[PDB]
Amino acid sequence: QLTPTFYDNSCPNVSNIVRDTIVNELRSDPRIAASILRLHFHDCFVNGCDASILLDNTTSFRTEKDAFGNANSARGFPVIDRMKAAVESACPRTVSCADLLTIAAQQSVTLAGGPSWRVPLGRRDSLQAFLDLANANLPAPFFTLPQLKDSFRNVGLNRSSDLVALSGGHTFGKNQCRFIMDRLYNFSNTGLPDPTLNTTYLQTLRGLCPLNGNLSALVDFDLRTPTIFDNKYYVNLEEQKGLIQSDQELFSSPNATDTIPLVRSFANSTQTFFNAFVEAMDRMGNITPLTGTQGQIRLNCRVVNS
Ligand code: HEM
Ligand SMILES: [Ca+2]
Ligand SMILES: [Ca+2]
Hints:
oxidoreductase
């Protein structure tokens, strides 16, 4: 069983060391908090939160960093290396990379203005990486609501609240033009934009992402508060201003009978959203963890101990 007090005797200063690292990095890269939360998400959706995503290539297994959902997208790995080294100095061979990334995600959310809570701990690190599994398990922005629900259920998150609350991670961070080009100019081979995208916002996005333009250009997920972790993401959905297809479907899909009330509830109350987010975050953080003597306490998050 994972417990929030796991390091209270062996490394009481772990959370503060992680926080300090992120605070320092945010000065030069205001996107790092968002990037770190996403790393935890992509770690947990592939064989559980076991830091498998942090492993680099070996001749026996490929890195998850080359998965369609991570390649030229996932970022912040050097920052994780930095905090890991600092924690290793303070508490040698004690904190797993899996737990470190979990704490980093929570601290990132709090630093961005979100809720503050102590995440359950005790996870251990994987002995391998899973590229094929990452390609199969990571959801895509073009997924329909049924597909999004399928993706979450596949890893153990059955609740629509899990899906709606965790999607709130898009209250900050960036998204490449490539992922919305269809919504802007030719959605589902109709030769027309996605009808569920507010037409005024459609114009703004087309200006940022012109046809045949730079597909790697970055746009903000939340037009209201781009870097602040709050419930504005849901207010956007209510106005048909969700950035990617998967965002807007939570409110506009024909299969959204169960998600619409959740979107409204979170848009109506920060407290309601924050409570649901913490609850969902801990549930995601509880996906098939290695515990006890299973796996290792990786010294270098990029490679298995030898
Ligand atoms: C429901 C399915 C989801 C889909 C299809 C999805 C899709 C995406 C896509 C397309 C990007 C843009 C990547 C890029 O342009 O490089 C992204 C970024 C991001 N996602 Fe999601 N996501 C999902 C769920 C989540 C969840 C559960 C969290 C966290 C709890 C999350 C947190 C983030 C954050 C914070 C960013 C910004 C990262 C950065 O700016 O570096 N996403 N996501
Ligand atoms: Ca993993
Ligand atoms: Ca926001």
